[PDB]
Design a protein around this ligand. Structure first.
Ligand code: CU
Lengths: 30, 21
């Protein structure tokens, strides 16, 4: 696998692919 | 955090696994 530059919605897509049915939390900074 | 690192820098799929439930 390779390193990733992922901003905005592209990071959400990556988390979805990585976690699948386990689900995930998307937790940006304040 | 990860949202920030992945965008301002880079991150790996293995680092993202840390956010799965
Ligand atoms: Cu885009």
């Amino acid at each position: 696998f390779v390193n990733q530059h992922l901003c905005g919605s592209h990071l959400v897509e990556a988390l979805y692919l990585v976690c699948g049915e386990r689900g995930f939390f998307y937790t940006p900074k304040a | 955090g990860i949202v920030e690192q992945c965008c301002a820098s880079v991150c790996s799929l293995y680092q993202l696994e840390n956010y799965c439930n």
